[PDB]
Design a protein around this ligand. Structure first.
Ligand SMILES: O=c1cc(O)n([C@@H]2O[C@H](COP(=O)(O)O)[C@@H](O)[C@H]2O)c(=O)[nH]1
Ligand SMILES: O=c1cc(O)n([C@@H]2O[C@H](COP(=O)(O)O)[C@@H](O)[C@H]2O)c(=O)[nH]1
Lengths: 218, 218
């Protein structure tokens, strides 16, 4: 996956007008948008097709899929019907639940991203101790795309070690949560950035600034 | 605690509005509580909650297995309650802050959180099972009053009931299609969740009535 400027916009605004305006304001800087439940549950799954119509961007559905295999299959089918290019799945519920998502993605020409460790403080309680094993599970299942946390670079580096240089790794927690763009790109292929851009007085300048700070990594 | 008619909750995971409405209507006299998940919501929009409330006298539990960072969890809960859900189901494995985020919105908005502690599918053994007792205890410490645990492992369901105490409210999926027994499950759960063995039956009403007959003395 070729992400323009190694920068993925986390569009978690919950108003259609604001979401479209802000994404429009930064369109010259990005070609990949992560759309999550805050936007989808507020404005409907049709918003995905609308982003494609307006921007032509690729769309990653950040739905943190975490159900039993049967339900996971349904969630992925509905998500890919709506035009998502990729979906993010939790690894914690185990291998069968991930495989269900891989099946639908293969069937519809889409990608699965495996979330292995998360960026918030609570991730330390249960997820962190399972994270390396979840990553190895991804490798065993043939997962090629992964998500890991900007805020703990030593953990992000370990995740990269496990999955190898061939795998694709994207990383949230940059900006608002304290992650540094450049340090993160030592290990991740692309950074995910939400509030630092979409709550900025000037989203375009915010995006340009981040890109400026990593220009030697582009 | 919520007063669930016949101790039976319909898991409405059909993905077509016409079918979902038809089946739910057919079992209306047996069930006043409906669990709506992402298969239906991602297919038909959050307005499906409004339509169920309009058409039926049913409480709605939004089975969204909320599993994000605290900030995103808050947004998901707000959107879900705004749409008319009485309650939302949240994963415990992302840790205490992520759960507390949901509890805080639920308190502010006058609605309820259910904490999913262990799951019913084979993959749950890999990571979730080993964390389940601690996730449950964390729920108790956080003041969670409503819980979800698996019918298919009676010993595990029993332990979960022990941890949360008799006053807590506990609902349990995996009955029917996944092999869980209604009667045995209600030894520990307040209510059973049933999907396919009702909604895929030639006569969903007869299917519901049959389950209810089997647990009449309970
Ligand atoms: O570990 C993770 C995984 C995520 O998907 N995310 C998501 O990435 C985005 C972070 O946005 P922000 O830059 O505003 O912190 C949010 O959409 C959040 O749900 C995260 O923050 N941490
Ligand atoms: O551990 C769990 C937790 C669930 O929410 N569920 C949910 O409960 C329902 C089970 O439906 P069914 O009776 O068709 O197996 C589905 O909506 C599934 O997503 C589950 O099966 N196991």
């Amino acid at each position: 996956m070729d992400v323009m400027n190694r920068l993925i916009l986390a569009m978690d605004l919950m108003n259609r007008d604001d979401a479209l305006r802000v994404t429009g304001e930064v369109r010259e800087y990005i070609d990949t948008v992560k759309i999550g439940y805050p936007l989808v549950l507020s404005e409907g799954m049709d918003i995905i097709a609308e982003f494609r119509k307006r921007f032509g961007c690729r769309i990653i559905a950040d739905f943190k899929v975490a159900d039993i295999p049967e339900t996971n299959e349904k969630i992925c089918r509905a998500t890919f019907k709506a035009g998502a290019d990729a979906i993010i799945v939790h690894g914690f519920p185990g291998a069968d639940s991930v495989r269900a998502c891989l099946n639908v993605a293969e069937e519809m020409g889409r990608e699965v991203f495996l979330l292995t460790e998360m960026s918030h403080p609570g991730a330390e309680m249960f997820i962190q101790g399972a994270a390396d094993e979840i990553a190895r599970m991804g490798v065993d299942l043939g997962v090629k795309n992964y998500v890991g946390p900007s805020v703990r670079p030593e953990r992000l580096s370990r995740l990269r070690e496990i999955i190898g240089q061939d795998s694709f790794l994207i990383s949230p927690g940059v900006g608002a949560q304290g992650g540094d763009p450049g340090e993160t790109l030592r290990f991740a292929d692309a950074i995910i950035v939400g509030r630092s851009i979409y709550l900025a007085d000037n989203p375009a300048a915010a995006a340009a600034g981040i890109i400026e700070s990593i220009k030697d990594l582009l």
